[model samples]
Structure formats: C-alpha cells, structure tokens
Target: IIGGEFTTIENQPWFAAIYRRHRGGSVTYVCGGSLISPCWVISATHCFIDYPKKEDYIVYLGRSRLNSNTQGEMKFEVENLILHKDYSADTLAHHNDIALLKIRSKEGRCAQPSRTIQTISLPSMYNDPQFGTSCEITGFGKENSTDYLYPEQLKMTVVKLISHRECQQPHYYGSEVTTKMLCAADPQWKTDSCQGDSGGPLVCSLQGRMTLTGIVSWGRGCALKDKPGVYTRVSHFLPWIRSHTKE
Candidate 1:
C-alpha cells in the first residue's frame, strides 16, 4: 500500500494473509483476504487461478506482520477454493474476480473469532455508495508499484471512491472498466494498493459499521495519476457468496 500508515491486526482483525508454498519448500506471501465467516475467506480469483491447488496454500489470520508467528496469529489449511465461474483471466479487464476459500484448523475446527481476529461485515446485497466517498484499504502489498519486495507489516490508507462512469472515461481506465468493478485512489494519486494487496478488503462505512465494499483486483501502476486502483465490487456478488457460505 503506497503512502499508507502502519496498522495492526487489532485495528483490522478481518485481514488475512495468503501464503503459497513454492515447489522448493519455501512459503511466500502472495495475497490478502477477508474473514467474512468462521469458515469462509474472501479473496481474488486471479490470485489462485493459475496455482489453484489447495494443498499449496494456507491462510494466516490475526497477524499484522507476514513474517511473524506470534501467539495472536492463527494459520488454517485451505479445505476448498471456489472461484467465480464467470471469471476470465484472458481479458485485459478482469471480470468476476472474486473467490472464496474454505479454511479448516488442525483440530478440524473453523476460525474462532476474537479481539485480534474477527469477521468483517458484508454490505447489503445491492448497496452502492456514491462517488467520492472515502473508504479504507488495508494490506501488506508493496509500498510502491515498482518495489520488488513486499512490506512485512500491514498498512492502511484512505481512498476516494470513483464511479464506474468516471473510471471508464477515456483518460482513466476507459471502456474496460465495468459495473462489476469499482475504482478508487488517493486524490493526489500518491496512496493506493499495489502488488501483494490482491484480494484485500476495501471497506467503507455503511449504517455506522465498516462494511466490505471492494476486493483489490488490479491497476496500471501503484498510485499512478488517472489510473485508479480497480476492485471487484463486493456488492455485485452477495447472492453468490451467501449461496455458497450458507451451506
């Protein structure tokens, strides 16, 4: 996250880190997720599209730092992963990029919510905030788009909402920006989500509670001018999410 402030798990308990175990026996942080239920985590489909093996991925919760193994941190093996059937990785514009991960504990239990680990609320089925609304985005992504190394600690930043129309402007993302996606960025284009922030939460207040609004999807560069960060609009997938998580 560029121009972001250091944050803690206590401040963003719903945050999760996705670690992909490589073929050489090393595990590396790849994406971020949100704990929306005891057994469900929300993320980006693109993160796991190519490497869709459940055995190769683990979900880490309650940790502010990716490199830490503190008592507050809890790890869960992915039981199953479900990507939106409509998601197409071949397109320049990512559509239906959201995904769900079912996690299980070593003891066969699901996540136990606590002060340092809790679920984030999902927005109403079709709620869409007006343009220019301020929202919060948290992740452990690169501080700069060009940076090769991701930050060890979590960071949070504020971004103003951009409408689908504004995002589709010729100067912005153009016609590729769809209603299924939303755009956000620092007004000055200095603060934004970057690599490794994929699948992280972009939450905004709804009826006095912070609600999951977006899932970090893609962008041209880290916080570049006129190139706002694109997100999978969570409001568009409530039915699909509830349908799967309910059972």
Candidate 2:
C-alpha cells in the first residue's frame, strides 16, 4: 500500500493474507482477503483467475508480518473458491469481481474468534458512504507500482471516498467506473492500494461500527496523481453474498 505505515493484526483483525502454493513446493503471498465469517472470506475475483483451485490456496489469519512463523498466525485451508457467476477479466470494467472462499482447518474447524482474529461487519445493501468520507485500507501489497517487492508487514492508510460521477470524469476512469465499483484516494493521491493488495478490505465506519465497505479491485497505477483506486462496492452484493454463504 503506497504512503502507508506498518500496522498489526490486532488493529485490523479481519485482514487476511492469501497465499498461493506453487507446484515447486514453495508458497507465496498472492492477494489479500477479509474474514467476513468464521469460514467465509471475501476477496476479488481477479486474484484467483489464474489459480482457481482451492487446493492451491491458503488463508493466513492473525498475521501482522509476511513470510514468518509467529505465535499469533493461524493457517486455514480453503475448502471452496466461489467467484461470482458473471465475473470476467475480459469485461474491461471488471464487473462482479468479487469472490468468496470457504476455509477450514485440518480439524474441520473454522476461524475461532480472538483479539487478533475477528470478522468485520458487512454493510447494508443500500448503504452508500458519504462522498469524501475517510476510510481505511490495509494490505501487504507493494509499496509502489514500480516495485516488485511487497511489504513484509501489513500496512494501512486513510483514503477518502470519491463519488462515482466524479471518478468517471473524462480525465479520470470515465465510463469504466461502474455502479458496482467504488472509488477512493488520498486528496493528493499519495496513498492507495497496489498489486498484491487486490482482494483486501476497504473498511469504513457505518452504523457506528467498522464495516466492510469495499474489496480492493483495481487502479491505473498506485497513487497516481489523477487516478483513484477502484474497489468492488460490497454493499451492492450483500444479497449475493448472503445467498451463497447461507446454509
């Protein structure tokens, strides 16, 4: 995350680090996710497009730093990977780029609540955060678009919401920013989510609680002057999410 500072899992307990296990027997961090339920996680569809198999992915909870073995870290194996039915990278605008992962432990248990491991509330279907409201974005994505190296520690920064109409101006993302998408950026575009941050949470306060308002989706470049980071508007899919996560 550009223009962000290090943070601990305790502060953002719902944050999840998703890793991809390669055929070479090495596991690498791929995307970020949110533990929305004990066994269900929310992420972006593009993150799993290349590696759609549940067997190849792992979800790490209570992890503040990457590539480490720490006491607080807990690993969960993905039992199912569900990308939205109409999602496609070929859509150009990346419509319905949201996905859910059902995770379980070897013992068949899901995430056990703790100080460093908790779920974030989902926003109501009709909720739309006020324009210019400050929101939080956390991730272990690259510090900048030009860097190949990702941050070892989870980082967070504040971003203000940008209205879809403003974000769709010809000078910005224009018509590519859809109603299913949310736009956010620092006033000067100093901080934003970049590569490896895809599928992470874009949290905001709603109904007096921190809510999962968006999922990290895409942007032209990390923290570019005139561009804003785009996210999957989670509220719009609340019904879709609830339907599938239902028993």
Candidate 3:
C-alpha cells in the first residue's frame, strides 16, 4: 500500500482500476470501476471525455495495491466505450453522469474469480434506508491533500446515506442533481471519495448482499461540511444497465 494502509481485494471483489497512458508510454492510474459482469464494466463518462476510446485503458483488478501487483491482478482490453446519450461533458451538471465499457479477455471470459476478483451485484431494492445507512466507497484515490494527484494503495471508506435535500439546500452544483443521483455524506467531513475515486463503486447492503447502488459521480471537494458527496444513482438506471448487458 502507498501510505501503509493495507486493504483486501476479497473485501471488495468487484472493484476495478482504470489506467491512463502518458505520452512517454508510461501508464498512470486515473479512475475506478465496477465489474458488473463477465464483460461489462461501469464508470463515469467524464473520465473518458478527453481520452475517449484511446485503446490504452488498462484494467486493474481489485486485488491490486497502489504500486504492488498482487497475484490475482489482471489487465483486460476494452472492446467498446458507450457513454450515456445525455451525458454532459461540458457543464457536467447532472445529465446522468455514467458510462459502460465492454472488455474482451484472452481466455474469452472477462474475469476469473478467485480470492480477489469477482463481480458486483446491481441493487435488488431501490431504498438505502435514507439515513444512517452504512455504505462503502472504494478506490485508489488521494489519501490526503498532498497525495491527491496519484494513489498507490486501494483505499476504502464507509459513509452514511443522507437526504438528497442536504445536497440540494447546500446548492452544490446548481440544479445538477435529481432522481438520477443520491447524496452520501458524513457530518464530521472526515471521510469520502476524492479526485481519482470517480467511477468507483458506492455499494450498500441489500437483502444481506453487497449491491452497487451508485457510481462515484461528483462532489463539492471530497468531504466537505453540508456539501455531501453525490453519486449516479444506479438503481434509477437499471433499465439502461439491463439493456446494455443483454448485448
């Protein structure tokens, strides 16, 4: 791990890492993703606004540490990049900030499950208890202000679900949020996702199973007071997910 914090891939079996290639042929990590199926991955569209379909997005498995490559860590090629028809790269204000990627594996299957890599489940229910519901946000994001640019270790944080109005009255993005997004926050502002955490999983428990309810979409500044973090509400877009998964 980068900052000496150790995490387990078995704990978050479906998390994926997105890497961007520099001009010097050196690849750097950029965003996080969720393995929703054998071939499909979910992320934020804004991540690929500049580097869309560059053929250099290396998929890092959940077992991967910041700088260390674990045994189960695997890389795959993206066969397709499908951004939402309404995704707004310009204003980035709502417009369903999400995307889906299909990958092709050498073995003809996406991920081989072991102690580390696995697939995440879509929400079986629409409710998140609304308050005090403990949910997980995992990514290789910035551990601190100085380390905000690059992350070496896969990090995980637990946040609570709050009313969407809290994110509204604070007026975070000025009419950017709607039913397509949900608010998750901590009043203490101690823990939340940051720069490199976009497109990661915002998983919560439903029916005793950890289900992906949101995709890390946007926020004011990581974890800020009254300016809670917002995520692309996955449950509201089940039709979109199902439609793409069938293909």
Candidate 4:
C-alpha cells in the first residue's frame, strides 16, 4: 500500500476480498487487473507482453489470499489474451498498456456470488484531468518483496493527483516522464505503489459509484519523495475502451 490516511486492503476487506488465483497453485508472475466485463479483465500489456506464450499467464477471479488454503478460493484459466497494438515492452512506454483476457470456464464449477467480479465505469471526458483528485489503488504487489513476484492478499494505497508539468520536474522522474501522462500520490512519503502494481486501477467514487480514473503505469519507486506515481490517463482512452465493450 502507498498512500497515507487511506484504508488498506486489510482495513477494507470487501474491496480486496474478491481477487482470486487463475492457476490452481500459488506462483509468481502475479499481475494486477480489474474486471472490465463478465468475460474480460483489464490489465497491463507488459504483464504478459514479453512472455513467449500466452498460456503462461493465468487470470484469477475471486479470493484475497494467494494461497488457496486460506478459506474461500476460486481459480480459472485464460482462454484468450488481447494486448493493445501499440504496446511495447522495450521502453515500458506502457502506451495503451492495457490488455484484455477471456476467462476459461470449467465444468461443474462456478464463482461465488459474493465474490462475483464486475466492470468499472470509464470517464466520459479526458479534457478534465483527475489531478488533485483522490483515488484508491489495490493489488497483490508487496510493500517490499524478497521474491520477484507479489505476495498474497490484496494491498491498497490512497493517492492524490499531481500536475503533469510538476510531475516531470527534473527532481522527480526527470526526462523519463512525459506530458502525455498524469500523476498522483500522497504528499507524505510513507505510501505509494511499487513495481508489481502495474495495470491496476486508480479508482475514484463519482455519484456513489466507483469509476476507473487511471491505470497503474510507472513511478520512481515506492514512496519516493516528490515523485508521485504516473498512470495512463483513463479519460484519454475512454473511446478505445468503449469500443472494446459490448453494448
């Protein structure tokens, strides 16, 4: 978890409790994602882009812990994977860093109603940036992991918006940051997203419903001073996202 004064996954059980394992066993290569539709999940392109094969990745649906032994659990396989055409692993440019996965169904099995996944609403306009706005992020990424993969259980952090110009200051991300991107974070140094948080949603509540305002993309490091996390501008990609959705 990254931001201060906000609830953590441990504090918000209902929010983090629905995540599940896609494969039957606990393993690394864990990536953050959101339920964009009943059959599709939205995640970072880089999460599976470099993998030699698509089958290597699994999409878990409902469960809080990485280990299935921890009470309630459910798992499934991915039937299809779709990466944005513009995605490039080299720069981690993460442009259109979004990807969609189709979940495979199993016979004589079903997801629990309490943990059922649902899609988040996308903003209608990109002209009004979410800067200075409050948002929440959740993932299995560790505060600090000893291993290459994320730990079990969902973790969350609160982040506040920061202007692109200020976020790109040489003191922060320096030349690596771009105007095309937007930023968010807690002013305090105690909280922020880490390496494994990629592709997660930066969600905000509008009219009593949670909506995705940004997608976790990059940052200088967990809780780095003056260097807020950068995210894909969700409003900018609303049209593309709508096109992918079924009416």
Residues 1-247 of candidate 1 have per-residue lDDT tens digits of 9997998999999998999998888999989999999899999999999988998998998988878775778889999899889888544568899999999988989999898999999988789777899999999999876789988778999999998888999999888888888999987988999888999999998778989999999998788899999999999999999888876
- Per residue, candidate 3 scores C-alpha lDDT tens digits across 1-247 of 1122446778888998887767788888878899998788899988887778648677777555766778767878788888887777435454578888887776656777777888888874465545668888888877765564666557788888876665566455546667778888765878888778889999988778888988888776667666667888988888887887786
lDDT per residue (tens digit) for residues 84-167 in model 2 = 989876434578989999999889999999999999999986797899999999999999778988888899999999998899
Against the unseen true structure, what C-alpha lDDT does each candidate score?
A: 0.90, 0.90, 0.77, 0.63
Segments of candidate 1 deviating more than 4 angstroms: none
* Root-mean-square deviation (CA) per prediction: 1.1, 1.1, 2.6, 4.1
- Looking at model 3, report the run of 10 residues with the lowest lDDT sum: 1-10
TM-scores for every candidate against the unseen true structure: 0.97, 0.97, 0.90, 0.79
Cα deviation of 221 in candidate 4 (Å)?
1.9
- Sorting all predicted structures by TM-score, with the top scorer first, yields 2, 1, 3, 4
Winner on TM-score (1 vs 3):
1
1-247 in candidate 4: lDDT tens per residue?
5433333333332222213234576456456777655566667776776662556665565556555543443455666777778765434245667766666556524333343344566666754444677788887665663446555556776778888777767787665666556688887767778777787788887667677777788776678788777887777776767776553
Clashing pairs in 2: none
- What's the count of clashing pairs in each model shown? 0, 0, 1, 5
